[model samples]
Target: DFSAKVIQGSLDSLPQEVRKFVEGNAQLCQPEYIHICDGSEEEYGRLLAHMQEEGVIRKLKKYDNCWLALTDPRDVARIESKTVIITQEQRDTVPIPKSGQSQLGRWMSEEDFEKAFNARFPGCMKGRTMYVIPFSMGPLGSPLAKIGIELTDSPYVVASMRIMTRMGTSVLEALGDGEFIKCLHSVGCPLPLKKPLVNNWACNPELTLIAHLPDRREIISFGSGYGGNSLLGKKCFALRIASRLAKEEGWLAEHMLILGITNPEGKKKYLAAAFPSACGKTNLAMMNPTLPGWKVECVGDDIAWMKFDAQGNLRAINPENGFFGVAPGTSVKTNPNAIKTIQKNTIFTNVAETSDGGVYWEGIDEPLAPGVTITSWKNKEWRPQDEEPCAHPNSRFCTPASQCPIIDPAWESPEGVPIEGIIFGGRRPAGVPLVYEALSWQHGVFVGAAMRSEATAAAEHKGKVIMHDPFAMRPFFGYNFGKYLAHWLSMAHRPAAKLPKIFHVNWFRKDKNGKFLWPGFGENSRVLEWMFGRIEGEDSAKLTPIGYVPKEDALNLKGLGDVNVEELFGISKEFWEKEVEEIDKYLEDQVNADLPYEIERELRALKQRISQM
Candidate 1:
């Protein structure tokens, strides 16, 4: 019995299946202690104290209820190369349903998956405490929420999960023998009895694996102790596994941000947009609009669960309780709302620590106070002369959405909010326009299928790999890319007028000299203003081969000085000729397997229209 006195209640207190799963893992791990999180403030404080004492985390000197954690440099970001999908049948022979097969990661047979799990997960927690965290992806008991139980060996994970999800006994109580996602994670470095563990950030890089069993509704992650890898509720279940479930259930689990925009007349509308990682999803969700008399409220920052309500109107709920946002490039000017949200009760990971106990990243507006020493994420004295950045590019801040000043009042509503618009975008620096509405839902799906963005560090590959980030779901989609597009098309069962209008936006387009053309950020509200009008039947756009471009003087430019409407809304036939060529190549090489016929039809239609130019 590991810490029998610590866990006083009988094991019978747990549901039969939950108890069995815990015991089965405990039998192999032989953990020194087993703690079932009660989701109490005291329990969180206790874990924070233990981690601080062990030197795994440092309490921020300037912020209350905040702490800083530096991960092993190698374990700073998601290792997508090693992340895989495990199925019951062999890869080639498996009768892949709907879409033929998944394009996101490697597909392993059930036998091989068991072999990998048996080899690494057994006894991996020999000298560590096992924290069992029961969490709900949305509000407790909400129809949009999904229950998942994560067993981890690191206390730091327990602290992060508390802020990121609805975790505790309430979630466990809601299960009542109903189905729940099973998630198992381990840092993979069992403590040695004969030697002291010197490294606070312990991980096995070579043995790292993030395996998702879509058919089984399970996730098994080993070796790494980083954000997405260890935080099972976020990408693993909310998007990857949940996508599979949503497809079957006639709903959508998307890597998108949900935000509510209010016009000057007090009318509110909701829009959901998907962008590749590190491409401004969080900033937009917590946007501080510069446009006078306009306001934006955050509903969800990273992912959304959407479906058609009884009235055939598309509605959505944010499935995540918190924001795990990229830290660098965040500041008072970029996102003041986010800065306010993380002022207290937050976790800063792999960020520079200051002697004053404040945190510093590359793009924050705060100037370093005199006489305060700053340390790099690796805990080394950092100087301006240093070549590398003080913080990892993918460094993050974990905080609850409830603290956001612009958070929607109905953010936790079980009924969800009706969506009027859906946006697809990414970090393209050229070719794409500032914004455009697809001619129809079918064309909108094509816009999503053609989504692309420049690579960023959020993905571990960085510049090492460059490819399409279709629907901004390339990294997280659990099944075939083509079928995922097909699902978007399937939503057309509703009348075209009832379904939310779809649009594509590009905020990072640049001139030939690499100068940003659009003054993005809050100024994006001007674009949203145009979209709101479009949704209400304003003729602001003229037909173009790609879609509809805003007519001259249609976009609000009253406050923005020296705006370049011509360059911003230019339709370069030569440029689009090449653009369609790239889309053709990408769909051919990457998504050819289950590629939907509608998408191809739209592609041909787009080409025919372009030829007329």
Candidate 2:
């Protein structure tokens, strides 16, 4: 009653017609679903009924469980459109900030946004049922998470949210004295010709509006029933919106993975890594360390929320309850734990299916089990003749993080683990050394600030263009890069907090013959072991001026008995200088009066350091 009162009060923010449409559904789901909330069985059954009636998913009973699968009318897979941030002002004047490069869009006065929303939303939900789902992003009672109430017309979304967030009236009822974020989404299923409602379609470009009122702690998105676009609570709130909120509140909101390093005998230290999509964040998170006595437990695979503790040690939490990750390329070979996770009670979207009513993504099971036809993303049945991938490249699964085989028992802790090492990585074939440590916190900040990797033309002939994804938050940062850099610099010396040692890693670097130099996967633990060695001050590093590079003789190359340890950590003179040139260009734009002067000074020092190295 109390939380609903506060959350329900925000409804005044919506247009009149939309408000009435949602209000009617709030009273429709029997109070038992939210009040006293005892079981997910009845609630989930009720949701499946709604989903079936709505025709978003089909129950596949051959496997004998609540397992079901969905296909989109539009062939979109993964997160298709780049997210837009509608500000309160126009694009140009917002100075919107700069990056080494990112593209957040224009500002529409709240009035204009409401106007555009009302015209398109007049009766978008008339035929579609509007459902109010209350959920929390992190641990239920943990101060580390944020509570939210999503009011939408898609039961598909509500069902997924149940798996992704702490959904139910208890989450709302518990909202008693606490504040909750107000989120609203619409599939943008426009009201058909003269008729105000129909399940006709969605869009891109100007069609999808992902507007946030960080000032008011709210999110308003329109159109597309796709992943991040349709799901307001996921990336839209957890990363994009939370990033801005964290900046204002003095904590750090980042797009990083959280992993706990636990030996079989039980000493645990945590490491948080930031890697762009192709850089193996998930594999690294759920890694099966090959070293004897070393055990890696996955705490999170996607995002991290970090803050300095009273002792100034950076503490981080994985705010998401589930992992919504890429479907293809996840195999028993690459990640046995991840493969084990998708086998049951999971939501499969845009993936292939076996003849026996089971699912099959690209890399999961290669040699088909004799005569088993696979269903492709376009809904066509395929035989072995169609050696083509039966699943779309961007297919995905919405799986509960708890399903992970290596999920850490301490994953639910509100206090989070103290981060001993922080890594920034990307898919790079060369230039960057295999693993290097920042000289100091400021140097680490510079390593992150000037982060770069090849991000262009897909081919051997065209080569690649290097781009910077600062802290791997290029796409998720909410404001100007200069301000964000200043924030990083500002946190370095805050009273009692000790900034975690920072390292840069490149797992995709390959040899001239195109063979991967790093064995990757579990062997990556060797890299982690070395990082931990540096953390304990037991390893000697070759100072490269850019960061601390590990000496060839000191690495723990146990499993990699055949590897050329020296080659694993190589530096190219030409590539290093080219990289500095780009960093200098980026430094030109990051120099603003609002930033701490020392932050800009370090870029120059790092460039000079690398130039002479």
Candidate 3:
């Protein structure tokens, strides 16, 4: 009993960093530790060896020096007398309580296993010892549990989870040991551990919110990453901290929108866009239009956290990270301001080398081979330039929101600005020129994917392997799916007499020579002038492009080319009533009729929901 007390007391005395490592090790030795295996067949043997050396197997009395060995079933006969060998084939045959067959069994047949020694780990080695971790014993339990059970079995999922957990613990340890804590303290983020949860090896469940007052009140929230893509890991932590502080301290107002602009006209008239990842939000916002009277400023290029102000208006706050500009193919002519931002170290992660040397920053003088263009350095060639390249999914060189240039003289007023309009953009290959207002919110969501071109779809699909593309990384946002949807609905619910108009615009519609059809919006010069003139004037009628003005009062001055105003506005009804209905029907038919018979049963349930809805 005293021995147990001494063990616990010793744990309490250990440094927070050391404690976490020991705790992690203990967790790995849990009775259910097999779950932590990276799903590699080789890991089974390693787990056995590690357990034996750690004396975990001795404590359990499950194995002696040579009592048990982990091996493939194909070699099980050969090693049965020598050691306990577990094979992938045997693991496949192992019964899962609820599921009819194991995942491995479904993928690999018994016949296939007989021919090759393709054995996966036979049992849950990692889960066996996971309970020893202090964090695993606490209310916070384990962060790995945040991932769904279904995904826990996936090799990729297990590997990523283990990697991030280690990295997070390391960063926290380094922060505690060095000036990192002091830096954070100076910024108003005081460490909250009294007994030091870090030392307990227990993951703290409580959210930590920190407010930095270097120039302005900037808040960051830190919390566990919900299940999704790993890319949001760091951002999730920052947001959690910021959200917690804003809620408890009332420092930040609710209903504020984070506005990102490329150029602003006198700080009043600004062109802004909400680009998820790579849908050209930056490019469009920075577009130098050939038109006149518009000015755009780079308010923010990436993230904007919005809240409602005391006046019941929507206002956007600036995130700390600066705009991550695509440096490849970017020139002084294409994006002059972006080029300047890159020079200031605000821009990061431009291409540097091919698997051979370090990354090349634009402003840095790095020698390059002949004919290497910046555009070529896109995700295709250049890897993400993160502070810690392999830190976590959400951590690329452009992440850690702290790395971004914090706005100087940050806005203190918490008043929310009324949202005048909404724009749901599409990647259109061919379409009527210019921006057009959506008929309604529902129609807007329905038409959201309508403008997608073949090229855009291909690009999105191809971006899966690329590091920074929005398409490849959007699934990580799944953790925040409900929140994003709620925000969208709430924005739609603003009690303004005329709801904020939504627009569906596209920039990819090109001509025969593969040139931009809407040349004015393509160039930042023309686009900025146009946006500037719209806000500078009180007359909303003048916002339309010169050649595409419509006659109907509500539909007037929207879209490209003159058309019967009613017809243009009537498109909304068709999309909502007919298009949505047809799409739903098509989906139902495909699911219920086209799928395999076994899957059709599940599809039928989905079809029933769709039908009723």
State the C-alpha lDDT per candidate: 0.85, 0.68, 0.30
Compose the digit string of candidate 3's lDDT tens values, residues 1-613: 1123221125454455434443443332222322222323254345435544753221112112111111111110101011111223332212232334221111233354323221211222232222111111001222111111111222222222332222222233233432111111001112242333221121112321121211112111122111221212223322322333333332221211233333334354323344334455544544444334433434344444444445554454443223433434444555444444443212122233333222344433344566543321223333235342211111112211222232222322223233444444444433334455443454443333222323222111333331211111121221121222233444445553333344545444555466655533345343333333333432433222111222235222334454333332222332234433443443333222222232223234323433443
TM-score of 1: 0.96
Write the residue-wise lDDT of candidate 1 on 364-479 in tens digits: 87887688888989899998668999888999999988999999987999978888998888877777789999999899999988887888998676573445788888888777
Is candidate 1 or 3 superior in lDDT? 1
Cα lDDT, model 2, residue 320: 83
Over 4 Å off, model 3: 1-272, 285-294, 344-420, 440-460, 463-487, 490-500, 520-613
Best by lDDT: 1
By summed lDDT, the worst window of 10 consecutive residues in model 2 runs over 29-38
C-alpha TM-score for every candidate: 0.96, 0.87, 0.43
The best candidate in terms of TM-score:
1
